[PDB]
Design a protein around this motif. Sequence first.
Motif, PDB file in Angstrom:
ATOM      1  N   UNK C   3       0.806  -1.205   0.000  1.00  0.00           N
ATOM      2  CA  UNK C   3       0.000   0.000   0.000  1.00  0.00           C
ATOM      3  C   UNK C   3       0.852   1.275   0.000  1.00  0.00           C
ATOM      4  N   UNK C   4       2.016   1.184  -0.634  1.00  0.00           N
ATOM      5  CA  UNK C   4       2.832   2.358  -0.910  1.00  0.00           C
ATOM      6  C   UNK C   4       2.671   2.816  -2.348  1.00  0.00           C
ATOM      7  N   UNK C   5       3.639   3.592  -2.795  1.00  0.00           N
ATOM      8  CA  UNK C   5       3.651   4.109  -4.141  1.00  0.00           C
ATOM      9  C   UNK C   5       5.048   4.062  -4.711  1.00  0.00           C
ATOM     10  N   UNK C  64      22.029   3.401  -5.769  1.00  0.00           N
ATOM     11  CA  UNK C  64      21.522   4.286  -6.809  1.00  0.00           C
ATOM     12  C   UNK C  64      20.368   3.731  -7.599  1.00  0.00           C
ATOM     13  N   UNK C  65      19.768   2.630  -7.163  1.00  0.00           N
ATOM     14  CA  UNK C  65      18.742   1.981  -7.952  1.00  0.00           C
ATOM     15  C   UNK C  65      17.361   2.572  -7.803  1.00  0.00           C
ATOM     16  N   UNK C  66      16.561   2.305  -8.824  1.00  0.00           N
ATOM     17  CA  UNK C  66      15.185   2.661  -8.847  1.00  0.00           C
ATOM     18  C   UNK C  66      14.392   1.427  -9.292  1.00  0.00           C
ATOM     19  N   UNK C  67      14.620   0.985 -10.524  1.00  0.00           N
ATOM     20  CA  UNK C  67      14.080  -0.288 -10.959  1.00  0.00           C
ATOM     21  C   UNK C  67      14.537  -1.454 -10.071  1.00  0.00           C
ATOM     22  N   UNK C  68      13.625  -2.368  -9.757  1.00  0.00           N
ATOM     23  CA  UNK C  68      13.958  -3.562  -8.987  1.00  0.00           C
ATOM     24  C   UNK C  68      14.885  -4.480  -9.757  1.00  0.00           C
ATOM     25  N   UNK C  69      14.499  -4.806 -10.989  1.00  0.00           N
ATOM     26  CA  UNK C  69      15.108  -5.936 -11.695  1.00  0.00           C
ATOM     27  C   UNK C  69      16.098  -5.554 -12.768  1.00  0.00           C
ATOM     28  N   UNK C  70      15.986  -4.329 -13.262  1.00  0.00           N
ATOM     29  CA  UNK C  70      16.833  -3.861 -14.361  1.00  0.00           C
ATOM     30  C   UNK C  70      18.257  -3.521 -13.911  1.00  0.00           C
ATOM     31  N   UNK C  71      19.239  -3.743 -14.780  1.00  0.00           N
ATOM     32  CA  UNK C  71      20.574  -3.242 -14.550  1.00  0.00           C
ATOM     33  C   UNK C  71      20.589  -1.788 -15.024  1.00  0.00           C
ATOM     34  N   UNK C 133       2.738   9.082  16.669  1.00  0.00           N
ATOM     35  CA  UNK C 133       2.042   9.926  15.729  1.00  0.00           C
ATOM     36  C   UNK C 133       2.937  10.564  14.683  1.00  0.00           C
ATOM     37  N   UNK C 134       4.203  10.753  15.025  1.00  0.00           N
ATOM     38  CA  UNK C 134       5.137  11.339  14.062  1.00  0.00           C
ATOM     39  C   UNK C 134       5.403  10.295  12.997  1.00  0.00           C
ATOM     40  N   UNK C 135       5.420  10.728  11.738  1.00  0.00           N
ATOM     41  CA  UNK C 135       5.557   9.819  10.620  1.00  0.00           C
ATOM     42  C   UNK C 135       6.977   9.733  10.114  1.00  0.00           C
ATOM     43  N   UNK C 136       7.358   8.532   9.741  1.00  0.00           N
ATOM     44  CA  UNK C 136       8.564   8.281   8.992  1.00  0.00           C
ATOM     45  C   UNK C 136       8.223   7.631   7.666  1.00  0.00           C
ATOM     46  N   UNK C 137       9.256   7.332   6.913  1.00  0.00           N
ATOM     47  CA  UNK C 137       9.128   6.856   5.559  1.00  0.00           C
ATOM     48  C   UNK C 137       9.944   5.596   5.402  1.00  0.00           C
ATOM     49  N   UNK C 138       9.316   4.573   4.829  1.00  0.00           N
ATOM     50  CA  UNK C 138       9.930   3.278   4.616  1.00  0.00           C
ATOM     51  C   UNK C 138       9.966   3.017   3.124  1.00  0.00           C
ATOM     52  N   UNK C 139      11.093   2.486   2.663  1.00  0.00           N
ATOM     53  CA  UNK C 139      11.299   2.245   1.252  1.00  0.00           C
ATOM     54  C   UNK C 139      11.855   0.853   1.019  1.00  0.00           C
ATOM     55  N   UNK C 140      11.479   0.262  -0.102  1.00  0.00           N
ATOM     56  CA  UNK C 140      12.049  -0.997  -0.467  1.00  0.00           C
ATOM     57  C   UNK C 140      11.453  -1.610  -1.711  1.00  0.00           C
ATOM     58  N   UNK C 141      12.062  -2.708  -2.105  1.00  0.00           N
ATOM     59  CA  UNK C 141      11.647  -3.465  -3.289  1.00  0.00           C
ATOM     60  C   UNK C 141      10.992  -4.779  -2.904  1.00  0.00           C
ATOM     61  N   UNK C 151       7.827  -3.093  -9.902  1.00  0.00           N
ATOM     62  CA  UNK C 151       8.772  -2.692 -10.929  1.00  0.00           C
ATOM     63  C   UNK C 151       9.852  -1.761 -10.417  1.00  0.00           C
ATOM     64  N   UNK C 152       9.484  -0.812  -9.543  1.00  0.00           N
ATOM     65  CA  UNK C 152      10.431   0.178  -9.035  1.00  0.00           C
ATOM     66  C   UNK C 152      10.290   0.292  -7.511  1.00  0.00           C
ATOM     67  N   UNK C 153      11.261   0.963  -6.914  1.00  0.00           N
ATOM     68  CA  UNK C 153      11.315   1.190  -5.491  1.00  0.00           C
ATOM     69  C   UNK C 153       9.974   1.729  -5.014  1.00  0.00           C
ATOM     70  N   UNK C 154       9.494   1.197  -3.897  1.00  0.00           N
ATOM     71  CA  UNK C 154       8.254   1.656  -3.302  1.00  0.00           C
ATOM     72  C   UNK C 154       8.530   2.442  -2.034  1.00  0.00           C
ATOM     73  N   UNK C 155       7.585   3.311  -1.713  1.00  0.00           N
ATOM     74  CA  UNK C 155       7.689   4.196  -0.563  1.00  0.00           C
ATOM     75  C   UNK C 155       6.353   4.250   0.161  1.00  0.00           C
ATOM     76  N   UNK C 156       6.416   4.290   1.489  1.00  0.00           N
ATOM     77  CA  UNK C 156       5.213   4.480   2.284  1.00  0.00           C
ATOM     78  C   UNK C 156       5.581   5.287   3.511  1.00  0.00           C
ATOM     79  N   UNK C 157       4.709   6.209   3.868  1.00  0.00           N
ATOM     80  CA  UNK C 157       4.871   6.996   5.060  1.00  0.00           C
ATOM     81  C   UNK C 157       3.971   6.418   6.161  1.00  0.00           C
ATOM     82  N   UNK C 158       4.506   6.229   7.358  1.00  0.00           N
ATOM     83  CA  UNK C 158       3.781   5.549   8.420  1.00  0.00           C
ATOM     84  C   UNK C 158       4.046   6.241   9.747  1.00  0.00           C
TER      85      UNK C 158
END
Lengths: 11, 28, 251
Positions: C3-5, C64-71, C133-141, C151-158
């Motif tokens: 449920x990230x983006x 430096x990645x964005x795409x999960x699977x691509x070189x 209550x203070x939010x942080x941000x989690x990222x991953x593939x 396909x690409x790195x996902x982000x969610x604020x929680x």
Amino acid sequence: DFEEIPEEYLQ
Amino acid sequence: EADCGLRPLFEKKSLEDKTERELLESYI
Amino acid sequence: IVEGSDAEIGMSPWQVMLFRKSPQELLCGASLISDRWVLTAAHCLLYPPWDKNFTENDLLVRIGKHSRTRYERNIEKISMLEKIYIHPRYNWRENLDRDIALMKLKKPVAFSDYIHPVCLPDRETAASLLQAGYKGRVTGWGNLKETGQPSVLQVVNLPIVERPVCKDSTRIRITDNMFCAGYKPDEGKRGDACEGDSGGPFVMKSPFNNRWYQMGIVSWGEGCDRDGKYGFYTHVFRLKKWIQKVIDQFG
Ligand SMILES: N[C@H](Cc1ccccc1)C(=O)N1CCC[C@H]1C(=O)NCc1cc(Cl)ccc1Cl
Ligand SMILES: *[C@@H]1O[C@H](CO)[C@@H](O)[C@H](O)[C@H]1NC(C)=O
Ligand code: NA
Ligand code: NA
């Protein structure tokens, strides 16, 4: 599922 | 690093990302 | 991440992918804390219940990645590991207490628009920001759902959750070296880390100095994005003396 990476990194 | 935590494509250019404001609003 | 983006380009330039050489696959997330040091979860490297015990030569880090699977030619940089350091009191037997590890790279990585270190918190930034209550941000593939892959790195604020609520959500013993985050069932919004997101960063942007700090490491959760469950994160500041000891000794 992953694109192959350059061989230089796998030596 | 003296420059840690400052992103080239955002803070270094004074551009915000699309959801960082949500974080800020929670820091009450 | 559930449920990230999709991340924006350059949104998380400290993001690291821990990559298994053979078979070639995602092992975990991680984060760049200097030109030579990468932070991750100990359980990404050592977890005997799953027969996981990686050595340096088993692994690469992809920065430096964005795409999960691509070189991502001309953007990502791939580094070999000089040495792994696991917290000496990491508790893989019970509850992942002190779920933290450092990796020293063989060579410094060149910073770029896509590659840049995150800050580690001081006591004051941690005291100020690690509040319910203070939010942080989690990222991953990692996986998009508990039961597919992005396909690409996902982000969610929680939001960080009150410690008693964390405690009451699980039978696992929680410690001061952990915090939990996520929305409550009555809060409507959703989101969590999931399998493959382990070791990645939970970051907060200080409103005092406008820098990003890594407050947590994706550690553990019971399922992904379940109502009434929360994700648990290694409390980086609580373990910072160990981090500094390792870098001071081996840097
Ligand atoms: N379910 C288990 C619960 C568990 C916690 C502590 C000790 C043993 C099992 C779990 O969590 N374990 C087992 C080892 C690695 C870790 C894991 O899978 N971590 C990744 C993870 C992190 C977050 Cl924050 C949210 C979702 C997930 Cl899937
Ligand atoms: C993990 O691997 C190292 C080296 O191969 C070994 O010494 C250790 O006993 C293994 N098992 C652990 C740490 O539980
Ligand atoms: Na409990
Ligand atoms: Na939940």
